[PDB]
mmCIF file of C-alpha atoms in Angstrom:
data_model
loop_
_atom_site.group_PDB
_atom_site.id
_atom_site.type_symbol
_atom_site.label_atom_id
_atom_site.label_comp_id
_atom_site.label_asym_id
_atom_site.label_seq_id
_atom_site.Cartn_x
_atom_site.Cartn_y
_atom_site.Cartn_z
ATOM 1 C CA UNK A 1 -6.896 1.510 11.105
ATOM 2 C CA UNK A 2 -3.721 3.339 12.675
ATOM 3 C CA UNK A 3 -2.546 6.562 11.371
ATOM 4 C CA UNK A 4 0.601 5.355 10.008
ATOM 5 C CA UNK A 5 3.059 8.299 8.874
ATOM 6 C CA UNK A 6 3.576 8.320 4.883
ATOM 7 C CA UNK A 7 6.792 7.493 3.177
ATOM 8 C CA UNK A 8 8.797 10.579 1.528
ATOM 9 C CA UNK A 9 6.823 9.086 -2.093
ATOM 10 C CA UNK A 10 3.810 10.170 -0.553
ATOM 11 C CA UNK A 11 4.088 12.789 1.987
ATOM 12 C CA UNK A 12 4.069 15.210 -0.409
ATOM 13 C CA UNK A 13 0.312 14.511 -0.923
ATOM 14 C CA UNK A 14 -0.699 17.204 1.584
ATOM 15 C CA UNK A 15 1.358 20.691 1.250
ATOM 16 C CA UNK A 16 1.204 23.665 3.232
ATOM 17 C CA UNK A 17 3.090 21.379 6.078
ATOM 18 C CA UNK A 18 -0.010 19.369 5.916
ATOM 19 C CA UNK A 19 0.997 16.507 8.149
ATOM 20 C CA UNK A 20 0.202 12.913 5.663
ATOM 21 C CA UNK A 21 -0.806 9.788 7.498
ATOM 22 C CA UNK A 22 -2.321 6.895 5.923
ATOM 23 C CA UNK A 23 -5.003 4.610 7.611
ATOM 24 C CA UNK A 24 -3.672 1.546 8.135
ATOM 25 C CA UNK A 25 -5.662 -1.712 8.074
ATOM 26 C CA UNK A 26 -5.878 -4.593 5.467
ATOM 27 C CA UNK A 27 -8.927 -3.183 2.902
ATOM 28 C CA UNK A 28 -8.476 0.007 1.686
ATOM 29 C CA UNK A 29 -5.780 1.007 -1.188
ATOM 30 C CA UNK A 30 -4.036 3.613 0.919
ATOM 31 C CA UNK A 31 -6.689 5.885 2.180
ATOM 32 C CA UNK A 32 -5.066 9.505 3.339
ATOM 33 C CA UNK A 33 -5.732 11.405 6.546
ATOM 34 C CA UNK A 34 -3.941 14.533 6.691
ATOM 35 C CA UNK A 35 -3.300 16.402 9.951
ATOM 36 C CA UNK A 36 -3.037 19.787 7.808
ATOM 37 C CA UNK A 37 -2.285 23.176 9.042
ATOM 38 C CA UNK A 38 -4.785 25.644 10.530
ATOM 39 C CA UNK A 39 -6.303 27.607 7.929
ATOM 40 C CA UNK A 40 -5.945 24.726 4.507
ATOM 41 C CA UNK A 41 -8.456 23.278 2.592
ATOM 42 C CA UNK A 42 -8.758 21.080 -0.330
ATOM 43 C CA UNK A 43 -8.281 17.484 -0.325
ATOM 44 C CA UNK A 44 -4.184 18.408 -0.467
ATOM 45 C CA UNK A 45 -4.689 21.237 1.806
ATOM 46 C CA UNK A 46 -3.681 22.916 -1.145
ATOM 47 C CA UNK A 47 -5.851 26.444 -1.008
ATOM 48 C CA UNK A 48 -5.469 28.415 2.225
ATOM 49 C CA UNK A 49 -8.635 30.165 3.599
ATOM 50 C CA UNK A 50 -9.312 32.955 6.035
ATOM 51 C CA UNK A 51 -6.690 32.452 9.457
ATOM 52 C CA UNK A 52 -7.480 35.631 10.730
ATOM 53 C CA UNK A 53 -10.471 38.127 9.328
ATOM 54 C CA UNK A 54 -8.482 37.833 5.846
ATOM 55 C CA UNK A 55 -10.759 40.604 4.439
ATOM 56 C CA UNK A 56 -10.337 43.382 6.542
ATOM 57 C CA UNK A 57 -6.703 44.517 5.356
ATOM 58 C CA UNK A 58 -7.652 47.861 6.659
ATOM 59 C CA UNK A 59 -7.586 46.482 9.913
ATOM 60 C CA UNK A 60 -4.002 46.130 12.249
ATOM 61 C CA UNK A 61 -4.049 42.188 11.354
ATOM 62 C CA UNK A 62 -1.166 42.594 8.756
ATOM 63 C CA UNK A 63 0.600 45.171 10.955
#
């Protein structure tokens, strides 16, 4: 049950530089486990959520 890097086919299943591995072992199809990037969700890491206090854009996070 390694993490075993995915193949340029498939690493494209997790975005945002989500980081694909697949879970090696001799049962399961080709089960993903995605090392994704802080602040992703979604089982692509497709939607990004709150890194910093994304809400307060009055606030001197954007500048």
């Amino acid at each position: 049950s390694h993490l075993v890097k995915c193949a340029e086919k498939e690493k494209t299943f997790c975005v945002n530089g989500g980081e694909c591995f697949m879970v090696k072992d001799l049962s399961n199809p080709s089960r993903y486990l995605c090392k994704c990037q802080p602040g992703f969700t979604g089982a692509r890491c497709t939607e990004n959520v709150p890194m910093k206090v994304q809400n307060q854009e009055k606030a001197e996070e954007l500048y």
